[PDB]
């Protein structure tokens with residue numbers, strides 16, 4: 001069970017750890033988060049009490065190193081940093097725990113929500129979408145644009161999601177125009193699965209990461225990517241059976257976790273209506289269709 | 301964006317453009333079968349591809365053989381239209397290729413855009429205009445060449461005959477849309493107006509009669525009366 005200690009909390013802030021969150025008051029004696037489950041990627045995120053922008057966070061995996069948060073008063077944010085000195089870190093964490101200055105990652109034993117949302121998400125794939133190779137953790141925020149968004153400006157601070165464009169030469173074989181446009185199986189199975197992702201696990205990893213960035217940061221480009229990757233499977237007549245059964249599980253837990261009050265901005269009417277009611281896979285997503293119908297029947 | 305009343309003069313500038321109308325590509329008669337069910341029988345169709353500046357019509361005849369053993373024909377018809385339009389552009393020398401293609405129906409946008417991915421500089425545009433190009437099959441010589449076709453065939457016409465010798469494209473296009481709106485609203489009356497005077501003939505190489513400028517004014521007047529008289533014949537207004 002790993003720990004992300006904090007130097008201090010000099011500014012009032014809502015702190016998120018995965019699907020949990022808690023309010024810290026300006027100069028509250030808060031020294032971090034303990035009992036973080038090993039074996040999964042985690043996100044720690046921030047929203048300053050004084051700012052309706054400034055919404056940002058760090059993807060990390062405690063197996064890759066010792067990570068702490070320290071407020072930077074020049075750049076005005078909580079920064080993740082790696083501590084390379086193992087014994088200094090262990091001694092800092094031990095003091096803070098003895099003085100009970102750390103909140104406990106509040107996981108219910110019965111509860112597989114976080115595993116279900118991150119089943120295919122790997123830190124090494126996150127680091128290729130985010131790109132800051134001097135750090136073992138990845139910064140994301142509300143405003144970061146995707147490579148696709150920038151094609152339609154600063155490349156260093158972009159989300160490098162796989163570009164998906166249904167009206168592109170990549171998506172459409174010469175002489176198979178109607179076939180490839182109405183049935184995206186070629187584009188899904190040959191171009192994207194066999195060609196770019198190599199396997200369904202990498203494809204699902206990027207889909208899950210896109211969803212989490214959309215939900216935790218309200219990142220518009222991540223939301224567009226999540227919907228595109230769903231629509232590309234739903235618009236394919238030929239999908240491996242295991243991929244369809246797994247997609248149904250992935251989307252079920254994403255819809256289950258979505259805050260009710262964000263379903264108006266985070267869910268695209270056209271995509272969901274197409275996927276559940278018109279597409280080739282309209283009868284393949286039983287769990288996802290039942291939760292969407294019971295939770296968001298207006299959207300549809 | 302969309303071609304409308306606001307941006308009408310753009311049709312007669314010096315940027316090569318084509319209108320594409322797919323309304324006569326897939327044509328059927330609906331009939332009863334022996335068992336009292338309903339069936340369709342396809343007849344020959346055509347793509348109507350028109351340069352509004354020059355009058356140059358590229359009439360691609362769609363032979364019923366194209367449909368043999370195919371499903372979802374109303375959907376295939378749009379993709380077939382897009383394939384033929386893309387093949388026509390590819391067949392033209394670069395300096396004759398259109399800069400824009402305007403589709404008379406919005407359902408043609410995606411099929412044409414996907415067939416023309418190789419031509420990123422050619423803009424594919426819808427129109428807000430309600431163009432009467434469906435009545436092309438009311439022009440006897442165009443109807444005749446479509447119905448007699450025994451195979452796929454491209455036939456090349458000037459839909460303005462020799463009018464551009466005396467009038468501008470703007471006026472020629474206005475005269476064409478008036479004639480086609482009339483034919484579309486009341487084909488019998490419209491044809492009566494065009495052929496009533498036996499002294500005025502159609503040249504062998506023309507589609508329309510050889511009217512003097514004064515005779516065109518009279519004809520155009522009779523066409524506008526027919527259109528309003530039919531609009532008061534239908535609407536009780």
Ligand SMILES: Cc1ccccc1CC(N)=O
Nearest residue numbers: 355356357358456457458
């Ligand atoms: C279609 C047409 C009409 C009148 C004259 C010549 C043509 C053929 C061409 N423009 O390639």
